[PDB]
Design a binder for this molecule. Sequence first.
Ligand SMILES: [Cl-]
Ligand SMILES: [Cl-]
Ligand SMILES: [Cl-]
Ligand SMILES: [Cl-]
Ligand SMILES: [Cl-]
Ligand SMILES: [Cl-]
Ligand SMILES: [Cl-]
Ligand SMILES: [Cl-]
Ligand SMILES: [Cl-]
Ligand SMILES: [Cl-]
Ligand SMILES: [Cl-]
Ligand SMILES: [Cl-]
Ligand SMILES: [Cl-]
Ligand SMILES: [Cl-]
Ligand SMILES: [Cl-]
Ligand SMILES: [Cl-]
Ligand SMILES: [Cl-]
Ligand SMILES: [Cl-]
Ligand SMILES: [Cl-]
Ligand SMILES: [Cl-]
Ligand SMILES: [Cl-]
Ligand SMILES: [Cl-]
Ligand SMILES: [Cl-]
Lengths: 92, 93, 84, 83, 98, 95, 106, 104
Amino acid sequence: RKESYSIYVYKVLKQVHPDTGISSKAMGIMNSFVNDIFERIAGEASRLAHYNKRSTITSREIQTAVRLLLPGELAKHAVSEGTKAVTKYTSS
Amino acid sequence: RKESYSIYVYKVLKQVHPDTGISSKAMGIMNSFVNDIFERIAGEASRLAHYNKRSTITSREIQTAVRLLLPGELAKHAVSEGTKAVTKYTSSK
Amino acid sequence: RKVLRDNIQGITKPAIRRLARRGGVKRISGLIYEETRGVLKVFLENVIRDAVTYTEHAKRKTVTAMDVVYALKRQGRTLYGFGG
Amino acid sequence: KVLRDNIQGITKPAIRRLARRGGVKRISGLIYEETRGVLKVFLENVIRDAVTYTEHAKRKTVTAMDVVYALKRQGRTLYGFGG
Amino acid sequence: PHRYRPGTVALREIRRYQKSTELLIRKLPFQRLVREIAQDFKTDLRFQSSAVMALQEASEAYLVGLFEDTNLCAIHAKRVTIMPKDIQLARRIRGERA
Amino acid sequence: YRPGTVALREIRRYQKSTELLIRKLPFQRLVREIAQDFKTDLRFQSSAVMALQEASEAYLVGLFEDTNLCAIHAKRVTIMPKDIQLARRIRGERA
Amino acid sequence: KAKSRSSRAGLQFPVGRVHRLLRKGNYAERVGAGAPVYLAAVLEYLTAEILELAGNAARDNKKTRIIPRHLQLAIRNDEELNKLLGKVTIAQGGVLPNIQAVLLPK
Amino acid sequence: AKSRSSRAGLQFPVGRVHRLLRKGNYAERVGAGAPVYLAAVLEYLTAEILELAGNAARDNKKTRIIPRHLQLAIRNDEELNKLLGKVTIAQGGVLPNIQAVLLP
Ligand SMILES: [Cl-]
Ligand SMILES: [Cl-]
Ligand SMILES: [Cl-]
Ligand SMILES: [Cl-]
Ligand SMILES: [Cl-]
Ligand SMILES: [Cl-]
Ligand SMILES: [Cl-]
Ligand SMILES: [Cl-]
Ligand SMILES: [Cl-]
Ligand SMILES: [Cl-]
Ligand SMILES: [Cl-]
Ligand SMILES: [Cl-]
Ligand SMILES: [Cl-]
Ligand SMILES: [Cl-]
Ligand SMILES: [Cl-]
Ligand SMILES: [Cl-]
Ligand SMILES: [Cl-]
Ligand SMILES: [Cl-]
Ligand SMILES: [Cl-]
Ligand SMILES: [Cl-]
Ligand SMILES: [Cl-]
Ligand SMILES: [Cl-]
Ligand SMILES: [Cl-]
């Protein structure tokens, strides 16, 4: 009973490698991966909010969580991707 | 930031070692300890409630949490203490 | 409901050797087999105890894969592939 | 430009006494500099995270609790600095 | 290139096992070990098959990692042969018997 | 006396002691330099530097313990860079 | 028919579902509207990174379908993903081929 | 017995622990028994460490527990050492212990 993201990992896979499939065992790994990362980020955003006596998790808590949790370039790119998405969404 | 339990720590100290004092720096260590353990247990109790789709943290979630988080022998003592307290609290109700 | 015993002996010399090989090990002393059994038993006992704790908390009698995954998380190990 | 090399303010004798507290009987001359590298990585890791906390709160002063939270990120729980 | 001692065989075995992903402990024996261990903590526990498999994946991954560290400890002492002392050092440093 | 005897008496002395072993002001300058590489105009509370010092010393002493075990394992009494590197590798601190 | 939050953000991962999962976890009293867009974008970005690397490793062994082995090769051959996933076990992943140099013949 | 602590036979503050559980983002609701059980565990673990730290203070002829004595208590007790295996006690130092092979 963990969340499935299979449809979404399929779409992403088609954008990156239109050529290539993924076995269901591999999809099971990818699902564990997305759940794990969601939980780490959300957990850290929750702590940040509590530390700062904030009632609300916003994109700022997610951004800081991302910076804390992800190493090096992965974090820089993740932060750029998050920021872009919020910019697009806000415009659109 | 963190919650102070100094007064309570002092009272426990008086029961276990009535003629022993405790330093300010030692009290700071004890407050960190209490907050740490509180956070660990509450955290696991929250996990347990979510896993089991329960909206409420009860004494059952605290107890399971204690059993998960503490080493076995120490867990036995803690569980007996938690259980005794809940029993007394429920009695004179 | 037969009483299972001595099943640690089912972790045989060739199995342990294969594991050491995957671990890049070239040569193995004769005393490693019994050591490895003892190490594995401790690891398993710990994980199974926690798994069963989650199982009993839920008032189930069947240990599930998610009970195991939670148990492992509790030891600081994150296992992928069993969330379905 | 400017020389920024404060890691060399950590002395040979300080490193030796840390090692002695660690039960070490004898020390190769090459350990001092090795130690300095490993300390600098450790502090860089913790301080990076502590300042992330500080910036998130829009503060310009790093507090003891920022450090305690950063250390918890590296899996270390420090007692004594919550007051 | 050396030619066909216990060392050369050992090296082909490393290549073979590092290439593959199959579990290396026999499944039924592993299952019986799991069930025996559980027999203390509770009478009448059943395991889902995939619970046994999870336990097996985790256990093997654990052993394999521990062998890697053990191997580095042997090598540190200028040996090629792992010994219990190597396992014990690895475990102490990892914090499992600290 | 023998360097061995001196070393042993030093272990005993510093294992009984709890005081911080790195000079306060040099530690402070080191923290300030590292913080300035991340963000200029940052300042530390004094208790923040002390937390960092307690943590850093605790870490090093633990690392020396494991390093020591690694030297003994190789039948040495002298710790070497390879001993630190083995300890840190098994700790997962380095790839 | 209303345009999805994901579409509006330029994402494949589900903004509305992420918002909902954020609320169900009781991480805070309130969850702001931008939080799930940001989070979904990160999850998608990581997912693309790994799939990109695993698909390459599938191709490097003459394979057209990603299996756990490929995910494991991709993660552990990548310095940053290996560090992110340092305490993770990929079931049926195996290990990297790697023998210590002293064990090999001169 | 008037306060919730008294009714539970505790020194640690039940009412306060309840409020902390509710304000912490742990669940939608917290039942009345939870803070009682949690207070009791905190109180018992606090007693363990104090018993042991007071013992260490007395062994060194001291009448005041300092961080040293908390460190000695924890590290010399197998169970507390396991519980607090990733904890650093500020000013706690380490246990006196030299590896046998290093002694003359
Ligand atoms: Cl927001
Ligand atoms: Cl009683
Ligand atoms: Cl056999
Ligand atoms: Cl062999
Ligand atoms: Cl999962
Ligand atoms: Cl000096
Ligand atoms: Cl020396
Ligand atoms: Cl604290
Ligand atoms: Cl298999
Ligand atoms: Cl069976
Ligand atoms: Cl695992
Ligand atoms: Cl050898
Ligand atoms: Cl041996
Ligand atoms: Cl620390
Ligand atoms: Cl030597
Ligand atoms: Cl060296
Ligand atoms: Cl190193
Ligand atoms: Cl939804
Ligand atoms: Cl919603
Ligand atoms: Cl690859
Ligand atoms: Cl190789
Ligand atoms: Cl009360
Ligand atoms: Cl309750």
